[PDB]
Design a protein around this ligand. Sequence first.
Ligand SMILES: [Co+2]
Length: 257
Amino acid sequence: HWGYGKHNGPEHWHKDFPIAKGERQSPVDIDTHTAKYDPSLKPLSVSYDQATSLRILNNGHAFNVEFDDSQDKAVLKGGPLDGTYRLIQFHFHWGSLDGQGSEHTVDKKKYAAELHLVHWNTKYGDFGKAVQQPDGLAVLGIFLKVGSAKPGLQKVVDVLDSIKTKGKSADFTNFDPRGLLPESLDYWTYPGSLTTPPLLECVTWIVLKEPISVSSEQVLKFRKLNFNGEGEPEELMVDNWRPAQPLKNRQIKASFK
Ligand SMILES: [Co+2]
């Protein structure tokens, strides 16, 4: 099936998912000089006080921290969005080395990792319906650089032992995603896609300007995960990022001057 290798990685996905060569694919390089400030954009509203985390899963491609999305409990609104988007999961993309790992780039700079907080538009009733719509999802993307530790991340890092291999899950209740956010909510936004198969063109991307800092030790623990299942040959879960795609006929807008 699809993955990140030589024989099954991003450069192959188009055969099973021709939308890979579409008009609104993600990620992209953010050219900071050509992104235009849009005074009509709003402050982002990220309301995570009632978030209810449930479980953490190694899906063979990343790990997902899953939320209860059966009520408006952790919602994204404002910014470029019309209406209300409910948090379903977050995950990361990361590298084999600190010099790569992010999906978006900023003036071609690659960060060590990138956090995706995935939310679906409540007007479509559930996730699976939302991904069929051009305004179905809102993904908040946050860059990670290596430096100081992120205290709020440590709970995630320390459960990773228990979900080493593909298909393993663990209870992961009472985790507060507010501890993964930077100080500033300044952002760039553009219309794009999921960055993994099926590559659906359903996402309003909201990429924060300010990265969070994590320690080397934290990211090193990400890199101990496995793509493989239990008792299969070990293949470290690293470089689970799609490179930048053509911007085509899109504009990236900045929320800040
Ligand atoms: Co992602």
